[PDB]
Design a protein around this motif. Structure first.
Motif, PDB file in Angstrom:
ATOM      1  N   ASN A  51      -8.721  29.269 -26.493  1.00 49.12           N
ATOM      2  CA  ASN A  51      -8.630  30.266 -25.571  1.00 49.12           C
ATOM      3  C   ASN A  51      -9.701  31.360 -25.695  1.00 49.12           C
ATOM      4  OD1 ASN A  51      -7.635  33.337 -25.398  1.00 49.12           O
ATOM      5  ND2 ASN A  51      -6.211  32.136 -24.290  1.00 49.12           N
ATOM      6  N   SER A  53      -9.998  34.502 -24.833  1.00 48.00           N
ATOM      7  CA  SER A  53      -9.924  35.851 -24.995  1.00 48.00           C
ATOM      8  C   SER A  53      -9.800  35.748 -26.730  1.00 48.00           C
ATOM      9  CB  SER A  53      -8.725  36.536 -24.639  1.00 48.00           C
ATOM     10  OG  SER A  53      -7.539  36.014 -25.174  1.00 48.00           O
ATOM     11  N   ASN A  54      -9.282  34.682 -27.181  1.00 47.55           N
ATOM     12  CA  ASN A  54      -9.448  34.586 -28.912  1.00 47.55           C
ATOM     13  C   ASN A  54     -10.927  34.192 -29.326  1.00 47.55           C
ATOM     14  OD1 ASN A  54      -6.531  32.335 -29.623  1.00 47.55           O
ATOM     15  ND2 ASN A  54      -6.553  34.481 -28.887  1.00 47.55           N
ATOM     16  N   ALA A  57     -12.515  37.725 -29.402  1.00 48.61           N
ATOM     17  CA  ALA A  57     -12.018  38.633 -30.111  1.00 48.61           C
ATOM     18  C   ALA A  57     -12.722  38.221 -31.534  1.00 48.61           C
ATOM     19  CB  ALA A  57     -10.453  38.486 -30.198  1.00 48.61           C
ATOM     20  N   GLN A  94      -5.749  36.703 -16.971  1.00 49.08           N
ATOM     21  CA  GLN A  94      -4.966  37.216 -18.334  1.00 49.08           C
ATOM     22  C   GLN A  94      -6.274  37.358 -19.303  1.00 49.08           C
ATOM     23  OE1 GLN A  94      -2.022  34.805 -19.965  1.00 49.08           O
ATOM     24  NE2 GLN A  94      -0.925  36.326 -21.083  1.00 49.08           N
ATOM     25  N   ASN A  98      -7.099  40.852 -21.598  1.00 48.49           N
ATOM     26  CA  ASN A  98      -6.957  40.723 -22.970  1.00 48.49           C
ATOM     27  C   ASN A  98      -8.616  41.261 -23.499  1.00 48.49           C
ATOM     28  OD1 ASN A  98      -4.370  39.817 -23.446  1.00 48.49           O
ATOM     29  ND2 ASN A  98      -5.109  37.705 -23.895  1.00 48.49           N
ATOM     30  N   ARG A 101      -8.733  45.204 -23.290  1.00 48.62           N
ATOM     31  CA  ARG A 101      -7.905  45.775 -24.313  1.00 48.62           C
ATOM     32  C   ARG A 101      -9.049  45.723 -25.572  1.00 48.62           C
ATOM     33  NH1 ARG A 101      -2.945  46.809 -24.867  1.00 48.62           N
ATOM     34  NH2 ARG A 101      -3.307  48.129 -22.954  1.00 48.62           N
ATOM     35  N   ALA A 104     -12.012  48.034 -25.230  1.00 47.50           N
ATOM     36  CA  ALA A 104     -11.697  49.452 -25.410  1.00 47.50           C
ATOM     37  C   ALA A 104     -11.224  49.867 -26.672  1.00 47.50           C
ATOM     38  CB  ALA A 104     -10.207  49.590 -24.224  1.00 47.50           C
ATOM     39  N   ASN A 105     -10.648  48.947 -27.527  1.00 50.11           N
ATOM     40  CA  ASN A 105     -10.162  48.943 -28.873  1.00 50.11           C
ATOM     41  C   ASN A 105     -11.237  49.146 -30.063  1.00 50.11           C
ATOM     42  OD1 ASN A 105      -7.383  49.231 -28.242  1.00 50.11           O
ATOM     43  ND2 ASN A 105      -6.891  47.126 -29.106  1.00 50.11           N
ATOM     44  N   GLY A 129      -0.538  46.302 -18.266  1.00 48.40           N
ATOM     45  CA  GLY A 129      -0.378  47.008 -19.556  1.00 48.40           C
ATOM     46  C   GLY A 129      -1.697  47.969 -19.779  1.00 48.40           C
ATOM     47  N   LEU A 130      -2.740  47.800 -18.979  1.00 50.21           N
ATOM     48  CA  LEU A 130      -3.945  48.582 -19.373  1.00 50.21           C
ATOM     49  C   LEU A 130      -3.867  49.890 -18.663  1.00 50.21           C
ATOM     50  CD1 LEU A 130      -6.409  45.634 -18.437  1.00 50.21           C
ATOM     51  CD2 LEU A 130      -5.866  46.417 -20.575  1.00 50.21           C
TER      52      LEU A 130
ATOM     53  N   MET B  43      -9.511  49.505 -35.638  1.00 48.42           N
ATOM     54  CA  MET B  43      -9.453  49.941 -34.076  1.00 48.42           C
ATOM     55  C   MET B  43     -10.055  51.357 -34.108  1.00 48.42           C
ATOM     56  SD  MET B  43      -7.315  47.955 -32.363  1.00 48.42           S
ATOM     57  CE  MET B  43      -5.659  48.326 -32.064  1.00 48.42           C
ATOM     58  N   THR B  44     -10.581  51.736 -33.001  1.00 47.82           N
ATOM     59  CA  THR B  44     -10.843  53.248 -32.457  1.00 47.82           C
ATOM     60  C   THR B  44      -9.664  53.849 -32.680  1.00 47.82           C
ATOM     61  OG1 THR B  44     -11.004  52.711 -30.076  1.00 47.82           O
ATOM     62  CG2 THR B  44     -12.802  52.428 -31.316  1.00 47.82           C
ATOM     63  N   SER B  47      -6.638  53.581 -29.669  1.00 53.36           N
ATOM     64  CA  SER B  47      -6.529  52.102 -29.631  1.00 53.36           C
ATOM     65  C   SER B  47      -5.096  51.998 -28.878  1.00 53.36           C
ATOM     66  CB  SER B  47      -6.910  51.342 -30.575  1.00 53.36           C
ATOM     67  OG  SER B  47      -5.893  51.534 -31.585  1.00 53.36           O
ATOM     68  N   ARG B  48      -4.923  50.663 -28.345  1.00 50.32           N
ATOM     69  CA  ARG B  48      -3.311  50.255 -27.867  1.00 50.32           C
ATOM     70  C   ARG B  48      -3.484  49.026 -28.457  1.00 50.32           C
ATOM     71  NH1 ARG B  48      -0.340  50.554 -23.487  1.00 50.32           N
ATOM     72  NH2 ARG B  48      -1.657  51.048 -21.767  1.00 50.32           N
ATOM     73  N   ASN B  54      -4.953  36.975 -30.555  1.00 49.74           N
ATOM     74  CA  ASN B  54      -6.436  37.507 -30.747  1.00 49.74           C
ATOM     75  C   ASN B  54      -6.321  38.040 -32.436  1.00 49.74           C
ATOM     76  OD1 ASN B  54      -7.147  37.167 -28.263  1.00 49.74           O
ATOM     77  ND2 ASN B  54      -7.328  39.222 -27.687  1.00 49.74           N
ATOM     78  N   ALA B  57      -6.180  35.162 -34.637  1.00 51.86           N
ATOM     79  CA  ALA B  57      -7.602  34.377 -34.579  1.00 51.86           C
ATOM     80  C   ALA B  57      -8.644  35.226 -35.229  1.00 51.86           C
ATOM     81  CB  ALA B  57      -8.063  34.219 -33.029  1.00 51.86           C
ATOM     82  N   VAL B  58      -8.614  36.667 -35.199  1.00 56.72           N
ATOM     83  CA  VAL B  58      -9.574  37.261 -35.902  1.00 56.72           C
ATOM     84  C   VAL B  58      -9.260  37.227 -37.490  1.00 56.72           C
ATOM     85  CG1 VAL B  58     -10.107  39.778 -36.350  1.00 56.72           C
ATOM     86  CG2 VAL B  58     -10.076  38.914 -33.922  1.00 56.72           C
TER      87      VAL B  58
END
Lengths: 162, 162
Positions: A51, A53-54, A57, A94, A98, A101, A104-105, A129-130, B43-44, B47-48, B54, B57-58
């Motif tokens: 994926n 997004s994975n 990340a 999607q 992800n 997010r 931003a994190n 949810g953002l 995380m900052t 964060s959310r 993800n 995966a990390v």
């Protein structure tokens, strides 16, 4: 062969570019980049696509690890951002949500290169949810050349896949 | 506080457990684990929640990095598996699907602790794009206690979140 994402030494000013999950980045771009800046996440022999997004990340968190997690909670205050993340022609909304997010994190800055495979819609992003602050600053560049013109990346990396 | 996923030294026999993206692992379980085995991804401050797939995966790719990517395509052939990944009461089917792909791609073994929030249904898994060999051998444990009894993990790690 392609170095792993952890086998490069990330530095301030690096831009990390990712193409769509199934297509990737065009060969015309990749063929003009040095071998050392085309990274590939390790996989077992008979693997299938991860994926997007994975993938992003994994790459972002490895870069942030190399940069000592500067700006994280319970670390001393740092001014400014980490690296810049670039989605070339992102297709699946999607994934983009992800990745918004994620960026931003982690304090990484996100860029999109048009054309997008979806319409950019604040309400759709919010419904996922953002919060507005997570996506309010994201730059959309008209082309890859215009991106290079706007951003003038000190170094550009590209994720490749088999 | 919680060490980062990269601030532990993963070893053969480690089991890495992840709770649902909306609620995590219960304090009754976490309270019996050493502080050193309760990891938190950096995380900052503001964060959310990061997507569970993800997060996994990390963590998986960081563990695999520490283990030298043993079993990856460009490397000599290895016979065993890497670590064991455990999803506690997984809720969102797409996360589990992504994690199944991840584990198949990296040679990590996946375990699910019931109850699941969705149907364990071969046809549904196939429709999501997974091949039978990716999910056919996934162990489903009736309870956390039964998991501990069956697996007797040499060390158990748990991902925590704020």
């Amino acid at each position: 062969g392609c170095p792993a994402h952890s086998q490069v030494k990330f530095k301030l000013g690096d831009y990390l570019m990712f193409g769509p999950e199934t297509r990737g980045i065009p060969m015309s771009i990749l063929n003009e980049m040095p071998m050392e800046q085309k990274i590939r996440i390790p996989m077992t022999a008979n693997s299938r696509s991860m994926n997007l997004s994975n993938s992003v990340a994994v790459t972002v968190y490895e870069a942030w690890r190399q940069l000592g997690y500067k700006g994280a909670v319970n670390l001393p205050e740092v001014k400014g951002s980490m690296l810049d993340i670039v989605l070339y022609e992102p297709e699946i909304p999607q994934n983009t949500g992800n990745i918004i997010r994620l960026c931003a994190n982690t304090g990484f800055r996100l860029h999109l290169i048009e054309p997008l495979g979806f319409t950019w819609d604040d309400k759709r992003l919010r419904r996922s949810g953002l919060d507005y602050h997570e996506f309010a600053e994201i730059k959309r560049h008209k082309t890859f050349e215009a991106f290079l013109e706007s951003e003038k990346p000190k170094r550009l990396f590209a994720l490749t896949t088999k």
